[PDB]
Design a protein around this ligand. Structure first.
Ligand SMILES: *CCC(=O)N1CCC[C@H]1c1c(-c2ccncc2)n[nH]c1C
Length: 340
């Protein structure tokens, strides 16, 4: 019979033994196990998406992206376990490298040295260069999606909200609902953006840098619109030029209705930070997304001079450009290479 964990089927087969519960993911239980072929412990996510089109779409997109990508700073998929036939397939199990920790757990307990902040930021941006070069947006960068091994090598994980970039279709109305983690949302999400531009990810990286400098989230909004008031409470009121860039009247008039808010100087919020780190932070946390630094510029910033080497910051060879029954078929096909 199958391996059981907490009374539930976790059917990973004889390759993977000595299971240990980790937690609940979006579509199922997550465990670690021992890989008897590669002789290391691995992470395994159980995914049961087939009852809903949206679950199928997020699962298929992540599988397609991660199987195409190959980069040192991006988690891979090592194996995918599923039944031999579509009729018998109800779950899929995704096997990935098991890391030591994530940046969320590290920031809860550990002060980061400036050298560690620098190195972590370099690797995040190196991975993001590759993602963005493939015309993909991650859309949910945050500390728990940054994994670290025992020597502080970093991998970006969780492409369950990723999308192909679509800057020509980014505009939306004021107060449009959004899926990604609140605290890392750029201001434009709450104003006029669907999060279909690369600048969405740079904002989230800027939030992560701020969180590495102080061990606390910089903009911990409690609800949708509070997120924007946190952002404006530090950046201050937008300039006329930046407001003029927001054509949507409801969004612009919301911003015009607010009392004046002063900018909080970065060196006052982060009195212990390197001055070059704060200059780069300022450029990532720029209100106007068109003025916000892009990933390659960030890599070239003086803060990262010890690491920057564009020849060793690879790009993707092959950038990217339905009812649930059809999506089940595509998942079955996309996972076929892992069958014996
Ligand atoms: C995106 C990360 C993910 O999906 N994981 C599922 C299990 C946790 C996480 C993961 C780790 C990890 C190890 C130790 N501490 C935190 C996270 N290592 N690999 C994965 C896939």
């Amino acid at each position: 019979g199958p391996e059981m964990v907490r009374g539930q089927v976790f059917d990973v087969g004889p390759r993977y033994t000595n299971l240990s519960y980790i937690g609940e993911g979006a579509y199922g239980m997550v465990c670690s196990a021992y890989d008897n072929v590669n002789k290391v412990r691995v992470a395994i996510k159980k995914i049961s998406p087939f009852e809903h089109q949206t679950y199928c779409q997020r699962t298929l997109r992540e599988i397609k992206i991660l199987l195409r990508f190959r980069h040192e700073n991006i988690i891979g998929i090592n194996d995918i376990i599923r039944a031999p036939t579509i009729e018998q397939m109800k779950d899929v199990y995704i096997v990935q490298d098991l890391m030591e920790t994530d940046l969320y757990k590290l920031l809860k307990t550990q002060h980061l040295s400036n050298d560690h902040i620098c190195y972590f930021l370099y690797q995040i941006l190196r991975g993001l260069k590759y993602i963005h070069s493939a015309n993909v947006l991650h859309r949910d960068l945050k500390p728990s999606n940054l994994l670290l091994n025992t020597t502080c090598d970093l991998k970006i994980c969780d492409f369950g909200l990723a999308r192909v970039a679509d800057p020509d279709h980014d505009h939306t109305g004021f107060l449009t609902e959004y899926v990604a983690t609140r605290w890392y949302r750029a201001p434009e999400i709450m104003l006029n953006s669907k999060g279909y531009t690369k600048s969405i990810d740079i904002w989230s990286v800027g939030c992560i840098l701020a969180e590495m400098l102080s061990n606390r989230p910089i903009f911990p909004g409690k609800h949708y619109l509070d997120q924007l008031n946190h952002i404006l409470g530090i950046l201050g009121s937008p300039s006329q030029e930046d407001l003029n860039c927001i054509i949507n009247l409801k969004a612009r008039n919301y911003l015009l209705s607010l009392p004046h808010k002063n900018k909080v100087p970065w060196n006052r919020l982060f009195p212990n930070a390197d001055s070059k780190a704060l200059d780069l932070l300022d450029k990532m946390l720029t209100f106007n997304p068109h003025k916000r630094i892009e990933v390659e510029q960030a890599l070239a910033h003086p803060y990262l001079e010890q690491y920057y080497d564009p020849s060793d910051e690879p790009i993707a060879e092959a950038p990217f450009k339905l009812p649930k029954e059809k999506l089940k078929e595509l998942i079955f096909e996309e996972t076929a290479r892992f069958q014996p």
